[PDB]
Amino acid sequence: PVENEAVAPEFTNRNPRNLELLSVARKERGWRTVFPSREFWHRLRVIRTQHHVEALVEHQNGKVVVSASTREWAIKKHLYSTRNVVACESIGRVLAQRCLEAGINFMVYQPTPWEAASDSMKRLQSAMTEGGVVLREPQRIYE
Amino acid sequence: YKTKPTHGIGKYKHLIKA
Amino acid sequence: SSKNLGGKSSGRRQGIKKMEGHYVHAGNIIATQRHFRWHPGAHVGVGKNKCLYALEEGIVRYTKEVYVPHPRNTEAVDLITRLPKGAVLYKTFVHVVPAKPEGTFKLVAML
């Protein structure tokens, strides 16, 4: 017999980013009556302030995996006025780049109608889609 | 519940006068 | 002389059927009632008659979280905007903590 054939009938995985990569992870359904309901794996958290524009990507637990804000010197020195549309466009582009460099390429964007009707959010979504990451996560296998 | 210490937490009409 | 009529009503048998601690499977109705008394939280769906049913197998928990109304419901919108700076609601939410996993890895063949 070969001593390297120690496989065992049961095999476990110690990676949290595993169940959602095979479309077998359960989504925390329910809520319904509130908006941002927890039926997803990754969200696109956007915070617009009169001074800076910050965008984050959080998981269903409550921790951020990647964020993009104008407070960082890497973005603040390449543009002017962290309030116009080009600032949020560059923030969306650098966030798409960082998420492509991090492997994540599926997130759910659930904004408000008054913000979705604006132009900054539309251009941010366009820059996110043109980067290589499409929004709207697919369904779950055996939900 | 009425007897639990968390009684009267969902009250909201007392903070408005309209 | 017997002016009132129609007061011969019956009970709707509405109430909580599964308290905190019972092992509730997937599909069991938590509680049927009128008006949103216990708002759904995690793994708790709703229907047409404002009923509560579980979605996964586990232990049903009853906590109190914040209440964030939907922007499309204008009634709740004005009810929230009529609140002073620093007023919360905090209603009772129903949550179902899952215990059994949704699958695992098992060896089949060996080629």
Place this chain on the structure above:
Amino acid sequence: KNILVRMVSEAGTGFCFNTKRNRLREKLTLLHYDPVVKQRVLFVEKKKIRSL
């Protein structure tokens, strides 16, 4: 006030349903699902058998 009529399909004869309609209006020409075709065809109002 209202009236109940039956809608006959153009493609795949044999499948008909019932739907409400106003009494002072004209006929109906809606889009209803047809199981024998598994698509969407036209339905025409024909033969009323109810006067509610």
Place this chain on the structure above:
Amino acid sequence: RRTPPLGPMPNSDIDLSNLERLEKYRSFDRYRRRAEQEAQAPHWWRTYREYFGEKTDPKEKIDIGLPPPKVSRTQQLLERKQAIQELRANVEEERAARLRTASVPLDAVRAEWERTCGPYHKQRLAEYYGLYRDLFHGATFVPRVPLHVAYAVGEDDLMPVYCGNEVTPTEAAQAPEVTYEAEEGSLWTLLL
């Protein structure tokens, strides 16, 4: 049968009188922010961050990384202020901002991010995947010196690995090319 509350009520710090003088919530975003900020405060009753398993977040770990270099923050702040003031004097940037057409280079911002808060994002992404939980068993560090590794497969492109990339085994059959800045007088030990 009435029991006293085991803590301060969430709607007790305000007074029920003179409500017409207090400023009401003029919008819904303020209420949403207030709710999401109050939901993070540790309460004394049953909350969501208790039953669904949080792996005990209030727990200080141990840092086993290199300390940050001593850099004067006031000098850096005044230099950044002078830089943004000299950049604001341009009129072409103003025209580009007014015409809604202003692009920024990607390589420059990538290099500046890797030089600045790069290690912080790398550490938070490593702790998100649970690397420090399985490797050092809770102990975490911060990669100060940047690291660059690129595989060699075809003949023109490359297969880089960053902070959570995806490399196929058919594109990682040979030893990659590890490149990192180092001085003459220090040894390193690579582990995979």
Place this chain on the structure above:
Amino acid sequence: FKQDQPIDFSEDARPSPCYQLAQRTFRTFDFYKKHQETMTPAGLSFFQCRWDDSVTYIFHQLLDMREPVFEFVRPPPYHPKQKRFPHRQPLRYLDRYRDSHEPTYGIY
């Protein structure tokens, strides 16, 4: 990692072939505990790996063994205890506890 003084170890060395899975049982915790006051971590980079067609050739001409297979199985669905008189139940209630969907015959 980053070590201060030049220190050499021999109890963690591997042979030139090193194609045995029993000897590659490496543990980073014990390796860092044995060398704590010498090496210091300073770099980290991780990626994701999936299955492809090269795994077969690897297990063939690199480990001298067979390729193990797996399958994401799921637990069986829950069903209550089958009573004697299922009051208000559809006709498909007997098929929920039925083993095989074939007409079985006993003494006949």
Place this chain on the structure above:
RNA sequence: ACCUCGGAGCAGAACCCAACCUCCGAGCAGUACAUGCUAAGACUUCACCAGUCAAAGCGAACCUCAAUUGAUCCA
């Protein structure tokens, strides 16, 4: 005076409980017919006859109100 059903207090915080105890009502409606077909799990007006919610799949673009009603035979 009434013949069916729902709501408010009696019945106060899981549930049920009657009176020829005091009041509002209902035999319907403002707009699209995927108001398509199957299929785990429950409540059930204190029995039965009845009524209601829903996992998932094939199929499709990406439902509001409180009672609001009619069984066997036959045509």
Place this chain on the structure above:
RNA sequence: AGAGUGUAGCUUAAAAGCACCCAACUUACACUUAGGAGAUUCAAUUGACGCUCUGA
């Protein structure tokens, strides 16, 4: 002459969060969208340039 002091109008913040105004809708208020101006007073925990109080 003595004392209290020291981040723009605010900070049991360390260059951020609250504030202000203008352009679009509104009889009007208001949400929202599109924009703008804002600060660690000086030399290395120290001493002095600004305000207030107690006086003459």
